[PDB]
Amino acid sequence: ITDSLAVVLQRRDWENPGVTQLNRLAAHPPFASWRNSEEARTDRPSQQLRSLNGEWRFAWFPAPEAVPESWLECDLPEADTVVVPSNWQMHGYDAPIYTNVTYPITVNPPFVPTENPTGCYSLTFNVDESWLQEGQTRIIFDGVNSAFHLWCNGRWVGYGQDSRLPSEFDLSAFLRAGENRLAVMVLRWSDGSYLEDQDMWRMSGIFRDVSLLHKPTTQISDFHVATRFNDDFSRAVLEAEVQMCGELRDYLRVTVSLWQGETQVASGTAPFGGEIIDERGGYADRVTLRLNVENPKLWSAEIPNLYRAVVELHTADGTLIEAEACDVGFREVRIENGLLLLNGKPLLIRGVNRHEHHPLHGQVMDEQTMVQDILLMKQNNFNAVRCSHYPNHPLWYTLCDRYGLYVVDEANIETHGMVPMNRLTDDPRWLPAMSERVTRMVQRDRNHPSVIIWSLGNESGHGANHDALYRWIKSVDPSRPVQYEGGGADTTATDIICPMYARVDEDQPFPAVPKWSIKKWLSLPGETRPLILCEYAHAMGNSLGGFAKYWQAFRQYPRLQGGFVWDWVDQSLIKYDENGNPWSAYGGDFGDTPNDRQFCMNGLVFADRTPHPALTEAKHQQQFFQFRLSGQTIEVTSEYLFRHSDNELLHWMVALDGKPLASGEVPLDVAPQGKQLIELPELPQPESAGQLWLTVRVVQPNATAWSEAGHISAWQQWRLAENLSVTLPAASHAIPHLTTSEMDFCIELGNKRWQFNRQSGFLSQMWIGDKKQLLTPLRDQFTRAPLDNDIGVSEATRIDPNAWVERWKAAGHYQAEAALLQCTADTLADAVLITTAHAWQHQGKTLFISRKTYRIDGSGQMAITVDVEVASDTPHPARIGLNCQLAQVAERVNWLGLGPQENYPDRLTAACFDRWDLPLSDMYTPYVFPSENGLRCGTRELNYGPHQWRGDFQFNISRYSQQQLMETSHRHLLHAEEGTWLNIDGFHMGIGGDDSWSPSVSAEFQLSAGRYHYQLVWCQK
Amino acid sequence: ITDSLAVVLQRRDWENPGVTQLNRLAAHPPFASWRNSEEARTDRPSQQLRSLNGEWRFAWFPAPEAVPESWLECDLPEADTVVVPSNWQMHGYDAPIYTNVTYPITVNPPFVPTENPTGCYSLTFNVDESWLQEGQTRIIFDGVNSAFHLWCNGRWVGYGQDSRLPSEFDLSAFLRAGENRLAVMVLRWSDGSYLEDQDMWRMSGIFRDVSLLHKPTTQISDFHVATRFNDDFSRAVLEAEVQMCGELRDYLRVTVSLWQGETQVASGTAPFGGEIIDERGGYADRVTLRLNVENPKLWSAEIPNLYRAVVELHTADGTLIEAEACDVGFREVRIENGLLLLNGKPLLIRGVNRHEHHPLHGQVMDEQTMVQDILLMKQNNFNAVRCSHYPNHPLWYTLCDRYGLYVVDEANIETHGMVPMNRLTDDPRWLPAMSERVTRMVQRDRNHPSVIIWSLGNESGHGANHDALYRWIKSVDPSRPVQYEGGGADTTATDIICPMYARVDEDQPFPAVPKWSIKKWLSLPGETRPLILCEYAHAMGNSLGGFAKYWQAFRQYPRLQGGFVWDWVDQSLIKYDENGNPWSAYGGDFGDTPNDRQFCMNGLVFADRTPHPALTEAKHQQQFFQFRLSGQTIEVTSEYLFRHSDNELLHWMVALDGKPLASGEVPLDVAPQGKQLIELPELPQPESAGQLWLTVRVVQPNATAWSEAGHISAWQQWRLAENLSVTLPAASHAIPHLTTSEMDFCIELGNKRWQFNRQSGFLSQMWIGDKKQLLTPLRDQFTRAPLDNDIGVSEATRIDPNAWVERWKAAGHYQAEAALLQCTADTLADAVLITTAHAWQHQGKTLFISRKTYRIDGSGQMAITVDVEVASDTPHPARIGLNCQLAQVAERVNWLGLGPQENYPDRLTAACFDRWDLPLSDMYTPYVFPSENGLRCGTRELNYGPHQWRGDFQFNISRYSQQQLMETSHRHLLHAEEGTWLNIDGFHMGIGGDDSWSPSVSAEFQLSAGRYHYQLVWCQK
Ligand SMILES: [Mg+2]
Ligand SMILES: [Mg+2]
Ligand SMILES: [Mg+2]
Ligand SMILES: [Mg+2]
């Protein structure tokens, strides 16, 4: 009866920050309750640990109040059978919401709305009665969002808050032998929701594992590990502290053993009872052991050496009560003199922020995905990751410990939508709630070597609660620094200056929380801390422009120790069309209101873990080897702090315009932080005209755990020389023949014909034989289908006038009208010459002027010369080029220029100058939200079909017109147009990306010169 | 129904540290809701504030479960009518318990025992319906111990923990017009009890005020005040921050005005809306005003200048919504360079720890008592007080603000009985509970100028929770330092080294938490903080020995800035005997188990606020004026930091053995921290033999608020000279006449006769005329009825062998047997001479030997000479003297020596050498727990009755024998013996008191010389 819903829900615990749990056991590191030492030592599965994952019954309601009393006793008739874990929105019950800052519910702390989607889960299972006779049986929920009540066999058990950490309960007294029934009522909204405003999809349910653990009555209740070293790390001390629960007897003992695989490295045994701590004594129920280790093998992301530690609770006779274990990594993290050091050396963090996301499963995680991520990261030169913005699934840590990644563990607290941001964080009333969120995290994760920094949360302003908590951690775990960006990134609550989106050289001086140029930030008066950006380089859409500026600064300034890119994967969800066709969905695609559209897609990889082209730029800038070329000598520098280049081969190669003249291989032998000089054999000195280029690549001959054999980990290229062409084209035996009509000028030469419309002044058509080559005339183009960065946050309802797009639109760039000023034709002795001049205007203003010359010679080549003038007072244009729709459609694209991937002016360091050949399809970048894409820069020759173009330009080629890209909101809706659309740019604006809600394209990448000149040659084969 | 006990008590909130309150409103400074500015400004009573104090119905039960459902609806038949506030133990319901460290309940956090004394209070009252139409009506409980549930009109309202701070609830929605009924169920024990283990009587109930407050819907919800100054305090800025609750509208305004009595000093008006604090904005519902004040009058305990500040919430038109106010003191507290400064000057704290205690009302406080305490303190030279160990009744602060006392406000947290002491404080699970205890205190008290330091609690070891909380305060209120003694007195959680019971020069090196000599403590490597003892000089019983050593150190070392004596009043309770006679009761007197007996009595004053003699010693050592004598010049030094000696007169006086030769008066004119030289007129130079002494006294001519006219605030005395007596007694015309019997020697001379028993060797009787003068023979005495300090914690069951008493007992001091070694009589020409020698032995060992001579001359004077030898290996004896029971009983006692109050060797600086005359009754000190008392030292002549004694000794005189004192446990049980008992000591051991649970008598005060000599003359008139 007091077990009744009517009674239980009366209290409304979910609308009270004073109640964050009821009957929840204490937090602790991960337990298995092994009953055999070897099993524990080898990480076998323990039988006192059982999964409850699988099929469960589920039913949904609009409000907790609508749940019917019966539910407690009997399964419902209308209940479905569902898989657990999972997020109910993923099964159709309600919609997932994609809002960023703005809370999904109404802001009225600590109330939640009355319609509050309740999900009743239930499960019927069997308990072995052995478990029922002796010991303790508890249930563990790894994650339930956002709050929940629990009943067992009709009996009310407890309540829990904080969707990111485990909730544990003693079931010992509710269990019956045989058949038992759990009834879990999960709520969408709770007072906990106010602390969970992260920018992600808002979902719900039992999204992480469900388990049962059987423990002895007298058990190991907690244990901590710590490593101390001498000056040179030649000697260490492992110190373990163990605590017990139960019946304390003098025959109890604890033993701790450390293993290196198979070898036992150290052991220690002792009886309970600590050292005196105060006037009242010590802890009778704890004991601390100290093991000495000589010449320990250190853990690092470069070489994740691990040890195994076993903790056995036993009697003096030798009889084992239970065993627990963990992997141990010997490393020291410290900040000294402004620098963050690891094992004595200063790190350089190549990081990324990563959310727990699956296009299919929502927020549910699994081994396979986790590993995939890890591999990709490691293969792309990343060495660290940040748990944006809550503790992650337990297994993650282990994987990082094993694979070698530095991790920042972050408390599940984000109050982004409050106003001001610290409205709750500065309130004592919310202190207790915040507290649990930090303490519990620490208690659970602190034995993992890969966690090297603790974070208090995200975007919750700065309040006293933060200071109090920062201090708590500092007292309980002094081995790791603490960081927190809120309230200015440099408050008293952080050991590291960790801004988000601060620029390299420009200051953004917002009131109260300005963001200084990172180089300047360090030098502010009295500042002495290291600086590591918690978030930088917003990878939304076609982005990562300017990435290299950061790397260069990081490399030049000691106290600039790196950052975490934002972010790893796009948060897109899969949906289906009527033909059972899947497509990538974003904010608002589920009828979700309010929503933030594409804002959920900022990753370096697509939801499916397929790479955006930006990933290469990252990989290259983050490479661990650096090169300098001096004469015939290449100087290699290693940025590894601990390892020697012992799985590295250097391949080099010389080519003349794509043609290879010489190749070689040399094995690397560089010590961490050292240099290696590589003497090049005498290089070939061709006579032929062209550009000679040297390219080097570093290859990993042997496979590793995160890479295959032959993995390329770094590269670099240099232009060695250039032989200018002083040649003259030979005589033609004829010259083109001109023909004036009223409508056009027509030039003919053999099968070839070209026609210029006299009213438009454009080359309107051209034939080869009797085959027309164009579907659209060739014309100047000054705009681009806007990128996400060009748009920022400008919405149609709420326009942002500073956004590039808003400015282009308003200046009429998109709707300017060409006006023919002049179109003449003349016959020279060697060719035919056409001259045009056009002006683009808009409402009286002349935005641009384009003057050209076309010269067709007896060889059938058409040379085009373009000179453009841009009104100094018009917003700089996105591009300066030409376009046309070719009639033809071919398979491949071949070019001599930078590649092979998409590259833009402020994102092209990773690209290489060579000869590339790809399928047409590869020249298109399927950004979920479409825009200008696919460009390749520094191109000297382009071939497609029978056509060939030469000059010095940038281009893109595909089946979609700029107009289509710009008018279609999702990639799945684009339709291939009639032929091939080609955009040849003399110049193109950068893409930016320092952030996606303000203009972020640096000045050096804006087309601000006023006058531009370019030229090309078009011909057929 | 959910309002039902069965349901409400089901949760068992009182056995869960996770639930510390339910539906409790937020904390804030004190509100009245004035509706008129002048009323607020003059502190008139506000009508929106109503007391519920008075008669209430009460009923008691053994357990919450035994409360009957009806209670909710209907008053009980068996209910009594009781006064509220009060402690139910004081009304007979159950017993108050006096335990110190050891918890009154079984240690099993967070469970409380099943028998848990429930007190059901109820009250029926009327609500004006005006209050019912508009606004908000809340109820406020200033203090309820230890936990409680509340119902209004049958409806369940909320729950609360923390017996020391106010609990508030919104009654708005439960009130009916007219007749309403409250039903409050109070519990003795709760999980809160684990944090309330202070050494005091354990009581319960509604011990502080009950009120109702009517507030507007749109109100002032909080406000803070702050004062900043320039370098020289010539200019200040008052800064007030105000927050509102309700409906925010643009016509709202806030005005803050500052008044100096009648004069308006400054004002400011503004509309809501703060400055930007972070990326999301500012607080729309707050506003901060800044008033400039030139040449502010500073607040100090020396001159409590106050200002009045008024806060008015109003509309733009001028219509007042509500007003709040407070007294403001302009002062700056800071620690700089190792020193604690106030207004720029380094303090010297003359403090005392004070509990809230009434012999009659228990823990209930009232204005009258509070003021009495304040007066006494101020009159005894105290300037500060510590709220040992919880926030006090609200009015206290105000009184201190007004009278001028520095206060340390202390959170209600003490976990003394845990093991180790920090078992809970170091646990995150208890963090939330601890947190509320600190935050709420700060929120309530922070506007009071007299609070100058915050304290995190007492005897709770040291845990991370403390660090976190220390930091929270530092962030929220940087204007006051934070201190906390636990875990060693010098942890990271304190800004001041604040030990308890550390000695002046000796170290007490306990493991983990040693207590160094305070002079040494400051110099420890790397230490730089100031040192102020949170507790020192344990005033238990006949104590305060050694007080002067502290004052001298404090005065010599800059960083030793004082301390707080332990403690103000004895915690004794009144009881009655069958004749309706009241007596002072202590631990165990109520059948209370377990108990700590007299340990609850450690004050400088008796429960009735009558002074123990130690108070004078304190008063003198703490005096604010110091004197030096050079030649005929007296040099006066002032220890006032802010005031000039403007109500001070110096009276001086010269006397020769008690006879006055010259007197004078001079007015003081000393600036704070200055000197004044006083030239003495030529002093008299008597020829007569004796000691010439100069005495000075400082008098306050005019009354003050805490003193009457003619109050003596300081004194000092010096021996100027001495003229030795070279005189010879004149001839007698006869000499005594001897007579030997077998049994005795009998000497006769006139009416006078003396008899010496030949078997005992003692003067057995003496006559004057036919009147016998003694009831007991004159004999050596080497012991004393033990003081509290002599006993310490030795209990009869659990003996403490280091306690002095244990050592004396064991050496047989108390049961040694005198043995006559020799008894001879001889006739000289001028007198009769008797010689004796005795040995005191015990089990074969000779402890002492006493050799005397008695010489009776023709003048009828008997001169006695005593030479004692003490075995070097026996514990030093308490005293070396003689005693006897005189037959006579007189009215007065007259002596020439130190006085007038009781003084001991290590407690006699406050005493003065003069001629005193008191009533016999005054020579007895009625310590509730009886012991040796009443001594007066440095006595040269003593007169009682017809007798007169001369020499140089110490004595005591009363109707109780040492044996009676030592055998009677309470003062009320002593019975006057037959005549007068006199103890004449040649020497006496010090009393100690650095602590009362270890030997604390310094070596210089132990009778360790081995050989002692003394002499006297006895005669009659
Ligand atoms: Mg809650
Ligand atoms: Mg956010
Ligand atoms: Mg509780
Ligand atoms: Mg205590």
Curated annotation (Swiss-Prot), chains A, B:
The annotation note on the cofactor reads: Binds 2 magnesium ions per monomer. Can also use manganese. Binds 1 sodium ion per monomer.
Q: What induces it?
A: By allolactose.
Per the record, the similarity remark reads: Belongs to the glycosyl hydrolase 2 family.
Effect the entry attributes to changing residue 792 to A: It forces the apoenzyme to adopt the closed rather than the open conformation. Reduces the binding affinity
Q: What is this protein called?
A: Beta-galactosidase
Q: Where does substrate bind?
A: 100, 199, 459, 535-538, 602, 997
Binding-site list for Mg(2+) 1: 414, 416, 459
